[PDB]
Design a protein around this ligand. Structure first.
Ligand code: HEC
Ligand code: HEC
Ligand code: HEC
Ligand code: HEC
Ligand code: HEC
Ligand code: HEC
Ligand SMILES: [Fe+3]
Ligand SMILES: [Fe+3]
Ligand SMILES: [Zn+2]
Ligand SMILES: [Zn+2]
Ligand SMILES: [Zn+2]
Ligand SMILES: [Zn+2]
Ligand SMILES: [Zn+2]
Ligand SMILES: [Zn+2]
Ligand SMILES: [Zn+2]
Ligand SMILES: [Zn+2]
Ligand SMILES: [Zn+2]
Ligand SMILES: [Zn+2]
Ligand SMILES: [Zn+2]
Ligand SMILES: [Zn+2]
Ligand SMILES: [Zn+2]
Ligand SMILES: [Zn+2]
Ligand SMILES: [Zn+2]
Lengths: 106, 106, 106, 106, 106, 106
């Protein structure tokens, strides 16, 4: 999908996680988030169209999705442990990574 | 899967592409390669276990899979155009990227 | 996904079909369209939140996706016959069905 | 699949749900039911082959699968809440919807 | 699925192959056949419920699906070579294997 | 995949099961094992390349995967019952079947 649709997927599933009433919903939403972040990490955003693939900006953009995906997976592990509230709190913390990328490259 | 199993998947499917007799086989194998490279780009290899995630080494390791995946996708586009020989030749060129990573980090 | 994300999926894949250079791309995009239309036909749109499920409006809304999905499948059959231009022309004709629903319920 | 195979899938999975000993089995079976009902709602049954797609009969036939799918999803939510007995009881109630369609159109 | 539903899947997809107008349909149907045969080879049929798993009957029953799956895959290879008529003729030949099993164990 | 890659998949997932901290991990790993065993049961191993498909050796090789898959499924049922330790103990017992095949045919 387009990068912007991956972003809508990330945003909508974060909301599902916040309002989830059970572990299965949190796991389902985190899985959809892992997939969207995977589809996005290789894209090139608008504000970076004019840059060498090896530009530290592109490398930094990637690192951001690398960090996000690591955090998504850690929250998913908590959900697999049936620690629903802890998984939801970890999902909240993701937003720091969303925000840090958006501040630089959105 | 473990990083080493992703590597076996990449290696075996390159061989299928070389010996393929039709576009469907080349597409199938390139698809399996995209998936293995996706599963690998987030891993941390042995020779790099002692490094900051932001270490230019980890960033470089990622860039290598970024490059590989771009080339896999370009070869896949050729196969979707039914340009089997051209796709096979592009698959050959991938090995430069395999080799460059292995020289540094394997 | 939310109804609005199904709509983004339909819109983006129509654009891929228009600019496609081969049958595989058209088939891939039509498949993603079938799936989005399937995810949408059971939803309830905003302008209809206040209506009996059996309201002729909800029945009409459904009929619209029923028609759309039939047309998506017919275009997909053309693509499976490798009739790329004909499939692209059929994809264009879909927009009449998009438009007719939007005029009533969007 | 043919409409009659979707019906066999619905019937067999209802039986699995009745005899299930755990939530995972109920969820698995309800998921297979959602998929079969999705594959069926767009079909046209024998006793209706001679009717305008907009015939209130075809619209009614669709509404029946719309209702069924809503009930399947509600039972699935109960199973995700680990309310196995409640999910099984909701699966029983589905049969009212099966029966009402069959009385008219089977 | 139940063994009898795997059999319905095999039967219906053979019919799709006979009436197919393009390679994609033949491949799609053969793929569904491979999956049904995979789901069946491990089952135990009624007329054999009273037999040691190592009974030469169970071993023979398995061999039959082993043979069938090999033939399904060979027909699929022909379809990937875009040899539609040859794939359809190979699909016809499958029925010898269906028949031989049914004569013994159905 | 090649038979040897199916074997790596079986081996790696057994290790995940041993070190699992929750049911979801055990189920995920057992599912990957079922799939690898399914991909392997139809192969022909090196030490048997020179044998009639109906050779009691090939029939015996198959029986071994038949037994393995039955045991994988039984362990999976325990995991679906949330009996994690019991599922892990059943996964241990699988190794008897791995070993018996390897002694004869590896
Ligand atoms: C970089 C490493 C990013 C991370 C991590 C996340 N996002 Fe993002 N996002 C990023 C960019 C470069 C853009 C602009 C894309 C464009 O086409 O302009 C966005 C955009 C969004 C949007 C708005 C989409 C739109 O309609 O234009 C949303 C709602 C959004 N991003 C959400 C989001 C969330 C919730 C994330 C973490 C869970 C997240 N993004 C991560 C870059 C990056
Ligand atoms: C880094 C960016 C790499 C790219 C691109 C590719 N490979 Fe690789 N590979 C890499 C590492 C760090 C390692 C060592 C992993 C370990 O556990 O030691 C490997 C290993 C292999 C192997 C051997 C696996 C084994 O049995 O130990 C193979 C056969 C292999 N890699 C193949 C391969 C191919 C064909 C690639 C391109 C198509 C490729 N790799 C890319 C790192 C990287
Ligand atoms: C009813 C039967 C519809 C059919 C067929 C299609 N669409 Fe639609 N669409 C419909 C509604 C009720 C809405 C409003 C949803 C809302 O939340 O307000 C929409 C919306 C769109 C949009 C805008 C999405 C947004 O960002 O708000 C787009 C781009 C769109 N729809 C596209 C689209 C296409 C391309 C279709 C056919 C291929 C199509 N829609 C069909 C209802 C219906
Ligand atoms: C209409 C909205 C239906 C709903 C809801 C369900 N079924 Fe159905 N079913 C319907 C029709 C029109 C038919 C006849 C199809 C034909 O080819 O004649 C059927 C058939 C069945 C059958 C028999 C299949 C056969 O072997 O001929 C079964 C066992 C069956 N249906 C089961 C079933 C169940 C369990 C349902 C709810 C969970 C259900 N159906 C819903 C139409 C509709
Ligand atoms: C054994 C190795 C078989 C092979 C190969 C195939 N079939 Fe079969 N089939 C087999 C059995 C033991 C049974 C009886 C199952 C039962 O529950 O009684 C069947 C049954 C069928 C049926 C009828 C299903 C029903 O409604 O009762 C059909 C239509 C059928 N089988 C078709 C079929 C086809 C087309 C096959 C090859 C492509 C095929 N079967 C292979 C055992 C075996
Ligand atoms: C026969 C019925 C087998 C069963 C059951 C299992 N394995 Fe196996 N395995 C088998 C063969 C014939 C071979 C040799 C394949 C070859 O190409 O030489 C193997 C090999 C392995 C290996 C080594 C793979 C390699 O790198 O060469 C491993 C690690 C292995 N098998 C593991 C394994 C496990 C864990 C099993 C049960 C859970 C298992 N195998 C079952 C044949 C059979
Ligand atoms: Fe659970
Ligand atoms: Fe083709
Ligand atoms: Zn797109
Ligand atoms: Zn809920
Ligand atoms: Zn692993
Ligand atoms: Zn391996
Ligand atoms: Zn070939
Ligand atoms: Zn949502
Ligand atoms: Zn969107
Ligand atoms: Zn293209
Ligand atoms: Zn069919
Ligand atoms: Zn059970
Ligand atoms: Zn069943
Ligand atoms: Zn059936
Ligand atoms: Zn056709
Ligand atoms: Zn291979
Ligand atoms: Zn864990």
């Amino acid at each position: 999908a387009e990068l912007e649709e991956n972003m809508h997927t990330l945003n909508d599933n974060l909301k599902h996680i916040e309002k989830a009433d059970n572990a299965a919903e949190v796991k389902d939403a985190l899985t959809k988030m892992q997939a969207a972040a995977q589809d996005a990490w290789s894209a090139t955003p608008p504000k970076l169209e004019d840059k060498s693939p090896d530009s530290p900006e592109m490398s930094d953009f990637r690192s951001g999705f690398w960090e996000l995906i690591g955090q998504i997976n850690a929250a998913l592990h908590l959900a697999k442990q049936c620690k629903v509230k802890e998984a939801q709190a970890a999902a909240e913390q993701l937003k720091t990574t969303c925000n840090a990328c958006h501040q630089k490259y959105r």
